[PDB]
Amino acid sequence: ALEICVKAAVGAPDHLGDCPFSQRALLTLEEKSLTYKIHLINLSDKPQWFLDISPQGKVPVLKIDDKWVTDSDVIVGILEEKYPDPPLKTPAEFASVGSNIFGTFGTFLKSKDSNDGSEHALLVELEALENHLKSHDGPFIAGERVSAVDLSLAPKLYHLQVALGHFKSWSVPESFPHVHNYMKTLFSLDSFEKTKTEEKYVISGWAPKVNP
Ligand SMILES: N[C@@H](CCC(=O)N[C@@H](CS)C(=O)NCC(=O)O)C(=O)O
């Protein structure tokens, strides 16, 4: 009986919160059509039973074969092994595409100094993604079907869109049309729609972190 601990929404602990690592795991569970129970963990008031099975107090955590396993990388790899069909393996050459976007996004979101180069560093990572997407068959990073890299990136690109839009009135430039198309593709996946955090909870999640 699979169970997953994920972040509860800031300000509404009975709703799904905004952890993109948790969403990567939920996406994988859904793309594998698996049944599972969700535990919403209020990270500002962690329950004791959760601390007892997540030694670092982090989410996500998956209960499988009666062991609780941390780290969304490990969780999605174990699911891929245990439930091989349909396959989500991304060819190795593409498995790190987009991998620096989320970090550059967070640095730009938190920047107070518009000459510190943070916008440019994000635009460089977006350009790398545009360059991959315009030169390889789509609609996903590895072609016709969604795979692990897309499931890792989708929640992160959603944060980028919602948070930079709301906090900075900033959106991915229209000069990256492939990135725009790719985001639309990911956000309209049935699995994405089912597992997504409401925008207002991406906002509440980030608000206390933007400018500590
Ligand atoms: N690398 C871990 C990252 C997990 C992580 O950073 N989770 C955050 C929520 S997004 C967390 O549990 N933070 C603990 C806290 O804020 O108290 C993974 O991929 O699972």
Side-chain angles (χ1 to χ4, degrees), residues 1-66 68-212:
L2 293 163
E3 306 185 23
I4 185 165
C5 293
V6 302
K7 180 182 181 191
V10 172
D14 58 355
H15 290 263
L16 178 63
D18 64 314
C19 174
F21 307 105
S22 289
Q23 195 183 6
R24 175 192 186 185
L26 291 172
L27 288 165
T28 304
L29 288 158
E30 291 295 327
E31 294 292 333
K32 294 294 188 175
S33 310
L34 300 168
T35 288
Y36 57 92
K37 299 265 192 206
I38 290 176
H39 300 291
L40 296 172
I41 308 303
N42 183 342
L43 295 181
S44 71
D45 186 17
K46 291 161 189 186
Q48 190 60 54
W49 69 265
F50 164 81
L51 298 165
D52 293 345
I53 60 79
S54 189
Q56 272 197 309
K58 306 301 175 67
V59 290
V61 198
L62 182 74
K63 192 186 180 156
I64 181 159
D65 298 319
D66 259 45
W68 286 98
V69 180
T70 61
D71 188 341
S72 67
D73 284 340
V74 174
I75 289 165
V76 304
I78 286 171
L79 295 172
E80 191 60 19
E81 290 186 357
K82 212 77 178 192
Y83 304 104
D85 287 313
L88 295 178
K89 173 171 169 295
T90 300
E93 180 183 19
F94 306 142
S96 292
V97 167
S99 61
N100 294 320
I101 294 167
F102 190 64
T104 58
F105 143 71
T107 299
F108 175 56
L109 175 59
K110 297 180 247 184
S111 174
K112 321 163 149 63
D113 171 3
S114 74
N115 291 316
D116 74 0
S118 63
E119 192 187 11
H120 178 78
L122 171 63
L123 293 170
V124 165
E125 302 311 312
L126 291 171
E127 177 65 47
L129 182 57
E130 184 77 11
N131 282 340
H132 172 84
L133 294 166
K134 74 191 195 161
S135 62
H136 297 83
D137 296 345
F140 301 98
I141 282 169
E144 190 181 337
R145 295 183 175 79
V146 75
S147 66
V149 66
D150 304 296
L151 302 187
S152 181
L153 267 189
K156 292 174 161 174
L157 293 171
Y158 183 72
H159 276 240
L160 185 162
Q161 177 176 288
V162 173
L164 293 181
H166 169 75
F167 289 102
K168 294 193 147 198
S169 294
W170 189 103
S171 60
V172 173
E174 295 308 324
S175 69
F176 297 121
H178 298 264
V179 176
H180 280 275
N181 292 345
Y182 179 63
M183 289 169 66
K184 289 186 186 170
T185 296
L186 293 180
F187 301 155
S188 65
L189 280 167
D190 284 350
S191 58
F192 193 96
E193 292 169 335
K194 187 167 187 219
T195 62
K196 65 190 288 288
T197 304
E198 297 183 46
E199 295 189 3
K200 66 181 148 165
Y201 304 134
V202 176
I203 295 170
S204 67
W206 275 107
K209 299 177 175 170
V210 149
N211 198 352

